[PDB]
């Protein structure tokens, strides 16, 4: 049945996220020593995605059995930690793109702002911003009886105007701020890389351009492919009412799995495919 396959893919993506995130955090803490700000950024991204993965499996129980198999307080806790991890991961991708833009396009300005204490300060800043922006989820969490006849976690009690308002705010933030800024930053990085006036007739320049373009395209494409369907399905459900259907519920569960898979795939892309990180890992 559909429920079985959705639970299976939930468990599989949870396992993948845990194993990848533990591997990345272990290798950083054991060999990277968190010496440069870049290792700090991947470390905090791995921490964020790790707790996001840990927040995943509680939703798998809700998918398998319609009723929430737990209490209301733990529902509030899991929704709050999920909001923490989701928004801090997206903001971490934003700040990593900003850091890369600074370093590549403006190396002088990079040295003007780049600093380890600056990295720690901005990490704490994004974590605090995540807490502040989820606070509506913290104070308006709870359980609604579902169409099946069972309780399920929900986040907007008084109202459905606030449903549309909250979802509009959420995806407008989560795309207009992160997606546009990372796309612009990487486009500027590509422009600066191609703007070199030195001939560099060797194939090293072509290889560098291909590597940078592929690395940018893969991360932007995976971010889009994993976040767009969830927001478009959510906004379509909120704006226009649709009749209940197991196909729609299965699609929603699958797209939630897809965004969890993006959380799983971010550390692989940001660490496993890094030359210095790869050398440090393959050292042992």
């Amino acid at each position: 049945t559909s429920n079985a396959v959705l639970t299976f893919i939930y468990f599989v993506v949870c396992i993948i996220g845990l194993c990848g995130n533990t591997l990345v955090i272990y290798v950083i803490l054991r060999y990277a020593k968190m010496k440069t700000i870049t290792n700090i950024y991947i470390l905090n991204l791995a921490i964020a995605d790790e707790l996001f993965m840990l927040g995943l499996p509680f939703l798998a129980m809700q998918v398998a059995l319609v009723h929430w198999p737990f209490g209301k307080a733990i529902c509030r806790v899991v929704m709050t930690v999920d909001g923490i991890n989701q928004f801090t991961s997206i903001f971490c991708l934003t700040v990593m793109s900003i850091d890369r833009y600074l370093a590549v396009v403006h190396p002088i300005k990079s040295a003007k702002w780049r600093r380890p204490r600056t990295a720690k300060m901005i990490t704490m800043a994004v974590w605090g911003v995540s807490l502040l922006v989820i606070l509506p989820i913290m104070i308006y969490a709870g359980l609604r009886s579902n169409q099946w006849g069972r309780s399920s976690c929900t986040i907007n009690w008084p109202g459905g105007a606030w449903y549309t308002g909250f979802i509009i705010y959420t995806f407008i933030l989560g795309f207009l701020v992160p997606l546009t800024i990372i796309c612009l930053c990487y486009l500027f990085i590509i422009i600066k890389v191609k703007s070199s006036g030195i001939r560099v007739g060797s194939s090293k320049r072509k290889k560098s351009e291909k590597k940078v373009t592929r690395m940018v395209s893969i991360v932007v494409a995976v971010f889009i492919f994993c976040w767009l369907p969830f927001y478009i399905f959510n906004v379509s459900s909120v704006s226009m009412a649709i009749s209940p259907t197991p196909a729609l519920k299965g699609m929603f569960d699958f797209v939630v799995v897809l965004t969890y898979a993006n959380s799983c795939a971010n550390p692989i892309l940001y660490a496993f495919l890094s030359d210095n990180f790869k050398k440090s890992f393959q050292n042992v």
């Binding site: 939703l59 399920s152 399905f233 959510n234 459900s237 209940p244």
Partner: peptide
């Protein structure tokens, strides 16, 4: 009735 991360 899908909303948030759980469909009702």
């Amino acid at each position: 009735x899908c909303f948030x991360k759980t469909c009702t």
